[PDB]
Enzyme design. Structure first.
Site, PDB file in Angstrom:
ATOM      1  N   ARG A   1       0.839  -1.189   0.000  1.00  8.71           N
ATOM      2  CA  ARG A   1       0.000   0.000   0.000  1.00  8.71           C
ATOM      3  C   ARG A   1       0.878   1.245   0.000  1.00  8.71           C
ATOM      4  NH1 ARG A   1      -3.608   2.395   4.861  1.00  8.71           N
ATOM      5  NH2 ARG A   1      -4.845   0.461   4.855  1.00  8.71           N
ATOM      6  N   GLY A   2       0.549   2.198  -0.868  1.00  8.17           N
ATOM      7  CA  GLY A   2       1.340   3.414  -0.945  1.00  8.17           C
ATOM      8  C   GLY A   2       1.365   4.145   0.386  1.00  8.17           C
TER       9      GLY A   2
ATOM     10  N   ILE B   1       0.195   8.007  -1.234  1.00 15.62           N
ATOM     11  CA  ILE B   1      -0.993   7.759  -2.039  1.00 15.62           C
ATOM     12  C   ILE B   1      -1.412   6.325  -1.754  1.00 15.62           C
ATOM     13  CG2 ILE B   1      -2.055   8.009  -4.293  1.00 15.62           C
ATOM     14  CD1 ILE B   1       0.477   9.523  -5.165  1.00 15.62           C
TER      15      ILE B   1
ATOM     16  N   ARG C   1       0.073  -1.334  -5.066  1.00 14.78           N
ATOM     17  CA  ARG C   1       1.005  -1.334  -6.174  1.00 14.78           C
ATOM     18  C   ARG C   1       1.899  -2.561  -6.059  1.00 14.78           C
ATOM     19  NH1 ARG C   1       0.841   4.656  -6.146  1.00 14.78           N
ATOM     20  NH2 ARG C   1       2.320   4.873  -7.890  1.00 14.78           N
ATOM     21  N   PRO C   2       2.119  -3.282  -7.156  1.00 14.00           N
ATOM     22  CA  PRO C   2       3.021  -4.439  -7.104  1.00 14.00           C
ATOM     23  C   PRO C   2       4.468  -3.984  -6.995  1.00 14.00           C
ATOM     24  CG  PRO C   2       2.317  -4.070  -9.349  1.00 14.00           C
ATOM     25  CD  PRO C   2       1.555  -3.079  -8.501  1.00 14.00           C
ATOM     26  N   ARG C   3       5.196  -4.580  -6.056  1.00 13.74           N
ATOM     27  CA  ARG C   3       6.593  -4.242  -5.829  1.00 13.74           C
ATOM     28  C   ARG C   3       7.364  -5.508  -5.494  1.00 13.74           C
ATOM     29  NH1 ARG C   3       5.036  -0.393  -7.997  1.00 13.74           N
ATOM     30  NH2 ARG C   3       5.247   1.814  -7.410  1.00 13.74           N
TER      31      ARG C   3
ATOM     32  N   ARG D   1       3.921  -0.593   7.577  1.00 17.03           N
ATOM     33  CA  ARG D   1       4.010  -0.950   6.167  1.00 17.03           C
ATOM     34  C   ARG D   1       3.023  -2.075   5.907  1.00 17.03           C
ATOM     35  NH1 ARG D   1       9.873  -1.552   3.665  1.00 17.03           N
ATOM     36  NH2 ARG D   1      10.576  -2.512   5.627  1.00 17.03           N
TER      37      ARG D   1
ATOM     38  N   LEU E   1      -0.314  20.200  19.276  1.00 11.80           N
ATOM     39  CA  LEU E   1       0.451  20.401  18.053  1.00 11.80           C
ATOM     40  C   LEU E   1       0.026  19.461  16.938  1.00 11.80           C
ATOM     41  CD1 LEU E   1       4.072  20.965  19.439  1.00 11.80           C
ATOM     42  CD2 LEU E   1       2.165  22.567  19.184  1.00 11.80           C
TER      43      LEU E   1
ATOM     44  N   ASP F   1      11.620  13.714   5.770  1.00  3.22           N
ATOM     45  CA  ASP F   1      10.561  14.662   6.093  1.00  3.22           C
ATOM     46  C   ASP F   1      11.053  16.104   6.036  1.00  3.22           C
ATOM     47  OD1 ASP F   1       7.857  14.229   6.383  1.00  3.22           O
ATOM     48  OD2 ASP F   1       7.871  14.544   8.559  1.00  3.22           O
TER      49      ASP F   1
ATOM     50  N   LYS G   1      11.170  19.558   5.162  1.00  3.43           N
ATOM     51  CA  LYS G   1      10.388  20.613   4.540  1.00  3.43           C
ATOM     52  C   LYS G   1      10.444  21.836   5.442  1.00  3.43           C
ATOM     53  CE  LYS G   1       6.214  18.281   6.217  1.00  3.43           C
ATOM     54  NZ  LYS G   1       4.803  17.916   5.928  1.00  3.43           N
TER      55      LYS G   1
ATOM     56  N   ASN H   1       9.241  21.780   9.077  1.00  5.86           N
ATOM     57  CA  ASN H   1      10.016  21.065  10.083  1.00  5.86           C
ATOM     58  C   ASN H   1      11.318  21.776  10.435  1.00  5.86           C
ATOM     59  OD1 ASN H   1       8.078  19.069  10.324  1.00  5.86           O
ATOM     60  ND2 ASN H   1       9.066  17.695   8.850  1.00  5.86           N
TER      61      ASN H   1
HETATM   62  C1  LIG Z   1       0.826  11.286   5.603  1.00  8.43           C
HETATM   63  C2  LIG Z   1       1.194  11.076   7.086  1.00  8.43           C
HETATM   64  C3  LIG Z   1       2.134   9.864   7.277  1.00  8.43           C
HETATM   65  O1  LIG Z   1       1.739   8.894   7.833  1.00  8.43           O
HETATM   66  N1  LIG Z   1       3.509   9.918   6.768  1.00  8.43           N
HETATM   67  C4  LIG Z   1       4.437   8.778   6.914  1.00  8.43           C
HETATM   68  C5  LIG Z   1       3.975   7.454   6.684  1.00  8.43           C
HETATM   69  C6  LIG Z   1       4.858   6.364   6.814  1.00  8.43           C
HETATM   70  C7  LIG Z   1       6.214   6.596   7.167  1.00  8.43           C
HETATM   71  N2  LIG Z   1       7.345   5.666   7.365  1.00  8.43           N
HETATM   72  C8  LIG Z   1       8.503   6.452   7.714  1.00  8.43           C
HETATM   73  O2  LIG Z   1       9.584   6.030   7.940  1.00  8.43           O
HETATM   74  N3  LIG Z   1       8.121   7.839   7.743  1.00  8.43           N
HETATM   75  C9  LIG Z   1       9.061   8.969   8.056  1.00  8.43           C
HETATM   76  C10 LIG Z   1       9.346   8.459   9.452  1.00  8.43           C
HETATM   77  C11 LIG Z   1       9.880   9.576  10.388  1.00  8.43           C
HETATM   78  N4  LIG Z   1      10.666  10.580   9.683  1.00  8.43           N
HETATM   79  C12 LIG Z   1      10.990  11.503  10.421  1.00  8.43           C
HETATM   80  C13 LIG Z   1      12.267  11.177  11.274  1.00  8.43           C
HETATM   81  C14 LIG Z   1      13.342  10.434  10.764  1.00  8.43           C
HETATM   82  C15 LIG Z   1      14.466  10.164  11.570  1.00  8.43           C
HETATM   83  C16 LIG Z   1      14.531  10.652  12.886  1.00  8.43           C
HETATM   84  C17 LIG Z   1      15.747  10.367  13.816  1.00  8.43           C
HETATM   85  N5  LIG Z   1      16.175   9.110  13.927  1.00  8.43           N
HETATM   86  C18 LIG Z   1      17.198   8.746  14.700  1.00  8.43           C
HETATM   87  C19 LIG Z   1      17.886   9.703  15.452  1.00  8.43           C
HETATM   88  C20 LIG Z   1      19.072   9.316  16.361  1.00  8.43           C
HETATM   89  O3  LIG Z   1      19.243   7.920  16.320  1.00  8.43           O
HETATM   90  C21 LIG Z   1      17.474  11.035  15.377  1.00  8.43           C
HETATM   91  C22 LIG Z   1      16.399  11.384  14.558  1.00  8.43           C
HETATM   92  C23 LIG Z   1      16.011  12.882  14.530  1.00  8.43           C
HETATM   93  C24 LIG Z   1      15.844  13.548  15.745  1.00  8.43           C
HETATM   94  C25 LIG Z   1      15.505  14.899  15.779  1.00  8.43           C
HETATM   95  C26 LIG Z   1      15.338  15.596  14.584  1.00  8.43           C
HETATM   96  C27 LIG Z   1      15.508  14.938  13.363  1.00  8.43           C
HETATM   97  C28 LIG Z   1      15.850  13.582  13.331  1.00  8.43           C
HETATM   98  C29 LIG Z   1      13.447  11.382  13.389  1.00  8.43           C
HETATM   99  C30 LIG Z   1      12.330  11.650  12.591  1.00  8.43           C
HETATM  100  C31 LIG Z   1      10.058  11.104   8.479  1.00  8.43           C
HETATM  101  C32 LIG Z   1       8.796  10.389   8.151  1.00  8.43           C
HETATM  102  C33 LIG Z   1       6.681   7.911   7.390  1.00  8.43           C
HETATM  103  C34 LIG Z   1       5.786   9.005   7.259  1.00  8.43           C
END
Ligand SMILES: CCC(=O)Nc1ccc2[nH]c(=O)n(C3CCN(Cc4ccc(-c5ncc(CO)cc5-c5ccccc5)cc4)CC3)c2c1
Length: 383
Positions: free
Chosen positions: A12-13, A16, A20-22, A80, A119, A219, A221, A224
């Site tokens: 599943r996406g 989106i 989807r086949p992967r 996932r 938040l 993430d 953007k 953030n």
């Molecule tokens: C539409 C809504 C939705 O559901 N979006 C979605 C869905 C499935 C996902 N699967 C997914 O991995 N992410 C993504 C999963 C999470 N990331 C964000 C992220 C990624 C790594 C760290 C992180 N790590 C390890 C250490 C130290 O060791 C430190 C950090 C850290 C700490 C402080 C500031 C910065 C980074 C922290 C956040 C991005 C997203 C998914 C997102």
């Protein structure tokens, strides 16, 4: 160090929510990777795909013969969702996945904080702005459902972790220098110098996460990014996976193409995000934006990125490399990773050890007296 299982799955996406086949590879090191087509075959494994310390669930909703890999990565619960044609195959996949996970096996309370603002809400909990009563310091608290289950200058640090009977709580620092979208919109555009500074500090944090932690942030953007009291960048970790909105999850303006296509992705995803962020800082607008989601995807996938006549050649070179559609061609997508960005002409003269050590003087000092000044929380000022 080899493959335990491989074959076609229905995934599943993530953004989106379509099937989807992967073609997925399961490896004894714990990596579970899916490709659009069977690969002929970065080498440093990424924890984003690891099956270590995950739980497997079999469900018949939303679709029969579905299984779900649920993992806690840092402070975010990740799911996932997969589907196979037969229950016999789902059992093969789950046991194989479970065995690999098993093979890789070898006080503060809520009463110390005052709730201030919500938040964000997610499927498995919420995030709230709190203030530690004793210190007056502000923190983001991730309250996650227990049932479901280092340090860098420019990452928001996780300070406290504690539990209740049904909730797991992560307490992380909350920068009080103001949201970066609040500053960019107020000033319209940043000078190339100012964008170089914020850009430099982001590159430094992304290099840490890729090399030391072997994790892609994915993430990156404007929303953030915050400034601390002194004007330095803080990349936030306030996210929570949510059920999509009917069904697309969040907004796609910042998503890397390979992420949109639910294709194989690696460290190059964050350089795309860097490009998106630095493009808007230096140009005053997002690179691709259209209300029709069919058009936004095409814009991100197909439309060649355009630049304003105001941008210098160095800036244009950096953005062009960062925003290459194909990650194998993208600036920073090679084995050198962050070094490709650091050595770029746009960052000539930047001593990268000075960046890590906050030696560079911030070009913009937020108007706060201390770490507890609440100016950028006040409603009167934020508007
Ligand atoms: C539409 C809504 C939705 O559901 N979006 C979605 C869905 C499935 C996902 N699967 C997914 O991995 N992410 C993504 C999963 C999470 N990331 C964000 C992220 C990624 C790594 C760290 C992180 N790590 C390890 C250490 C130290 O060791 C430190 C950090 C850290 C700490 C402080 C500031 C910065 C980074 C922290 C956040 C991005 C997203 C998914 C997102």
């Amino acid at each position: 160090v080899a493959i335990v299982k491989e074959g076609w799955l229905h995934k599943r996406g993530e953004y989106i929510k379509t099937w989807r086949p992967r073609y997925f590879l399961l490896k004894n090191d714990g990596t579970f990777i899916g490709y659009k087509e069977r690969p002929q075959d970065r080498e440093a494994p990424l924890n984003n795909f690891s099956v270590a310390q995950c739980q497997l669930m079999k469900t018949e909703r939303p679709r029969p013969n579905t299984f779900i890999i649920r993992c806690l990565q840092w402070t975010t619960v990740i799911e996932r969702t997969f589907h196979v044609e037969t229950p016999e195959e789902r059992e093969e996949w789950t046991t194989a996945i479970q065995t690999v996970a098993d093979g890789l096996k070898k006080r503060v309370t809520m009463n110390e904080f005052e709730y201030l603002k919500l938040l964000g809400k997610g499927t498995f909990g919420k995030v709230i702005l709190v203030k530690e009563k004793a210190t007056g310091r502000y923190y983001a608290m991730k309250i996650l459902k227990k049932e479901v289950i280092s340090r860098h200058p420019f990452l928001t640090a996780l300070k406290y972790s504690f539990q209740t009977h049904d909730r797991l709580c992560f307490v992380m620092e909350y920068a009080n220098g103001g949201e970066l979208f609040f500053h960019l919109s107020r000033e319209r555009v940043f000078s190339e110098d100012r964008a170089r500074f914020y850009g430099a500090e982001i590159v430094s944090a992304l290099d840490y996460l890729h090399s030391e932690k072997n994790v892609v942030y994915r993430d990156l953007k404007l929303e953030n990014l915050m400034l601390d009291k002194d004007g330095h960048i803080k990349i936030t970790d306030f996210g929570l996976c949510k059920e999509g909105i009917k069904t697309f999850c969040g907004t796609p303006e910042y998503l890397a193409p390979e992420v949109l296509e639910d294709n194989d992705y690696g460290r190059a995803v964050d350089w795309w995000g860097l490009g998106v962020v630095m493009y808007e800082m230096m140009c005053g607008r997002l690179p691709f934006y259209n209300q029709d989601h069919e058009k936004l995807f095409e814009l991100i996938l197909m439309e060649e990125i355009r630049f304003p006549r105001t941008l210098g050649p160095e800036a244009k070179s950096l953005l062009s490399g960062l925003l290459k559609k194909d990650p194998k061609q993208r600036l920073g997508g090679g084995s050198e990773d962050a070094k490709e960005i650091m050595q770029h002409r746009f960052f000539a003269g930047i001593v990268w050890q000075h960046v890590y050590e906050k030696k560079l003087s911030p070009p913009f000092k937020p108007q706060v007296t201390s770490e507890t000044d609440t100016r950028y929380f006040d409603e009167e000022f934020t508007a």
